[PDB]
Amino acid sequence: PPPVRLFGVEGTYATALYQAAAKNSSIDAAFQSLQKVESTVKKNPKLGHLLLNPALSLKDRNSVIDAIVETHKNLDGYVVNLLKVLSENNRLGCFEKIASDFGVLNDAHNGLLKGTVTSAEPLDPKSFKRIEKALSASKLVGQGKSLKLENVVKPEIKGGLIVELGDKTVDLSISTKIQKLNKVLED
Amino acid sequence: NVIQDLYLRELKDTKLAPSTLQDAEGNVKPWNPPQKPNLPELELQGPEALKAYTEQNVETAH
Numbered sequence: 001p002p003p004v005r006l007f008g009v010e011g012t013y014a015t016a017l018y019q020a021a022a023k024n025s026s027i028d029a030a031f032q033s034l035q036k037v038e039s040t041v042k043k044n045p046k047l048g049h050l051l052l053n054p055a056l057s058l059k060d061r062n063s064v065i066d067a068i069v070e071t072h073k074n075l076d077g078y079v080v081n082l083l084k085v086l087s088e089n090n091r092l093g094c095f096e097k098i099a100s101d102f103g104v105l106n107d108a109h110n111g112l113l114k115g116t117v118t119s120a121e122p123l124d125p126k127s128f129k130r131i132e133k134a135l136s137a138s139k140l141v142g143q144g145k146s147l148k149l150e151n152v153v154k155p156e157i158k159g160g161l162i163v164e165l166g167d168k169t170v171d172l173s174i175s176t177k178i179q180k181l182n183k184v185l186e187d
Numbered sequence: 188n189v190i191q192d193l194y195l196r197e198l199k200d201t202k203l204a205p206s207t208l209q210d211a212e213g214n215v216k217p218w219n220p221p222q223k224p225n226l227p228e229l230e231l232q233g234p235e236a237l238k239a240y241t242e243q244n245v246e247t248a249h
Contacts, residue, residue: 160189177189 003108007101010094014101017082018109024078031106033075034082038099040071052092061087113145115165118152120174123161131163140166 002015021030041048051064065087069080086095107114117123117131128149135147147165159174 174189178193181190181193 002105006104010097011101013082013085013094014098014105017078017098017102018105021076021078024076026076027106027109030076030079031102033072034079034099034102037068037072037075037079038096041068041095044071052095054090054092058087058090061090061092111145113141113147113165115147115163116150116152117161117163118154118157119161120153120155120157120159122151122153135163135165140168 002018005011005015007014017030018027021027024030041052054061056064065083068083069075075083082098086092086098115135117128123131128151132147132149135141135149141147157173157175158178160172160177162169162171162173
């Protein structure tokens, strides 16, 4: 059973990878090695970008796979079986997609809460820290998952702040308040 | 907060008062009070008609 199913298309692949590596026991190893080969795929720019797009054979695809396992002899065998799956399904256009998804499952398994505090401008580090403290203090943190605080800059969200994490947000942006004030003052 | 500031500043600092009656008059029907249209007169005064009608009107058959 995965740590909560997420993603259907491509994520059945990710789920499978997760549960299979749960039966491998080593999920972290798998993820780390996948991360490393994925990174060198991205840092292979000629045909590691320009042949991420299927247009070539099953057999040619297989030989690309063979080149990939020459690039790293550490990739476990489950993620080498994942290479087999992707070659067989001839879908390379969702390799990094699967990588991202496996990251989500993996860090859910690790248990790290995710969040973002989108604002109009990058906030103070004191603000960051106070918010980090607050979020950990709040019942939202289960003490089992540790927030990510990602500042996003969104001037379109004119002033204020919006805190986001879980399915729970508090939006005390200036834009929303102005919007509501204006709207009701058009009534 | 921001609500209060926006409210306070806008409301307090922006005051309007209604427009002049002259401008209003343009936008409405002004009205000048109707006059008396007619003063009636005597109903066919004089027995000239009457004598004629009394004599003339009979129209009885045999």
